[PDB]
Design a protein around this ligand. Structure first.
Ligand code: NL2
Ligand code: CL
Ligand code: CL
Ligand code: CL
Ligand code: CL
Ligand code: CL
Ligand code: NA
Length: 333
């Protein structure tokens, strides 16, 4: 018999209750602008699917970011555009400003409102306890918003969080792997960077949901409070699950595989072994102790579960005692 089906605990049917056109990105008609409205200033970064530049909008002299979409399925381009259009104006969501093609090369590019090219990975190993809580709360605002809008990011990692530390502002970027959540849909498991992949991806459980992003967020939190980059340091996708099993233990892993009737790749049969669930105290030392609290560990424990249904939702996470002082300072301001 096949895998047992799964549904999101929250925002399950939000796309069903929308007009078809909200989520039917294959049918979306893009009005392509002229990239000659912009002048590229300098190259900022190189990605698998994109080259990214600082640019000037000639018309108003406003600074922008241009992402030139490296050759890829047209379906994937419409998906990213539609998701960015749907999420435009959401809290801590990057703002799509324009969609253009190079008149010569015909290559499509996305134009975003300017953010500094200071990604979270550059800062997140140097934060105070309070700033970790503050910026985690800001990421959760973006995730609860996109989940509530029927979208899962599927590539949450430090390199996809842009931060202006001076102005205490954060944006979640690179929506190129994001998808619409539809109950009963089986998704591609070849998403996310190795160190942030949830167990559902690693065991090839395809009927996953928004909760994938909450695993990735837990991997970021563990890295930051323990000053361990990455927290789960696998050699490859098989060893990645071994790294997780040595921390979360094998008892809960095999119970998860039994619950969803998952057919575990034979490769796993000799490498997972038998491991106790480790107390988080084992990762605490003199250099990270100032970032670790009972509140931080209680919260982390409730993100890093094998069973995606067990993990906190983004809104449940925002309710956790770890954020009480952030929530109080926000109301004060
Ligand atoms: Br602004 C901005 C910056 C980068 Br780097 C992005 N990668 N994908 N979308 C982006 C938007
Ligand atoms: Cl601190
Ligand atoms: Cl990263
Ligand atoms: Cl998919
Ligand atoms: Cl590890
Ligand atoms: Cl222990
Ligand atoms: Na402590």
């Amino acid at each position: 018999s096949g895998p047992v089906p799964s549904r999101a605990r929250v925002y399950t049917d939000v796309n069903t209750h929308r007009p078809r056109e909200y989520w039917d990105y294959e049918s979306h008609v893009v009005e392509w602008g002229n990239q000659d409205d912009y002048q590229l200033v300098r190259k900022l970064g190189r990605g698998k699917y994109s080259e990214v530049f600082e640019a000037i909008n000639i018309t108003n002299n406003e600074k922008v970011v241009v992402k030139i979409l490296k050759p890829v399925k047209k379906k994937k381009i419409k998906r990213e555009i539609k998701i960015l259009e749907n999420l435009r104006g959401g809290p801590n969501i990057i703002t799509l400003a324009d969609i253009v093609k190079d008149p010569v090369s015909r290559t499509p590019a996305l134009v975003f409102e300017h953010v500094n090219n200071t990604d979270f990975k550059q800062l997140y190993q140097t934060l105070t306890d309070y700033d970790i809580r503050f910026y985690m709360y800001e990421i959760l605002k973006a995730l609860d918003y996109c989940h509530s809008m029927g979208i899962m990011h599927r590539d949450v990692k430090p390199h996809n969080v842009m931060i202006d530390h001076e102005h205490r502002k954060l944006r979640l970027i690179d929506w190129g792997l994001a998808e619409f959540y539809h109950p009963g849909q089986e998704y591609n498991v070849r998403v996310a960077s190795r160190y942030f992949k949830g167990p559902e991806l690693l065991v090839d459980y395809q009927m996953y949901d928004y909760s994938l992003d909450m695993w990735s967020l837990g991997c970021m939190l563990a890295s930051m409070i323990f000053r361990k980059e990455p927290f789960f340091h696998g050699h490859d996708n098989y060893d990645q699950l071994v790294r997780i099993a040595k921390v979360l233990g094998t008892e809960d892993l095999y119970d998860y595989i039994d619950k969803y009737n998952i057919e575990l790749d034979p490769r796993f049969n000799d490498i997972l072994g038998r491991h106790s669930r480790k107390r988080w105290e084992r990762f605490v030392h003199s250099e990270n102790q100032h970032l670790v609290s009972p509140e931080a560990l209680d919260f982390l424990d409730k993100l890093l579960r094998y069973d995606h249904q067990s993990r906190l939702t983004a809104r449940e996470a925002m309710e956790h005692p770890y954020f009480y002082t952030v929530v109080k300072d926000q109301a004060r301001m």
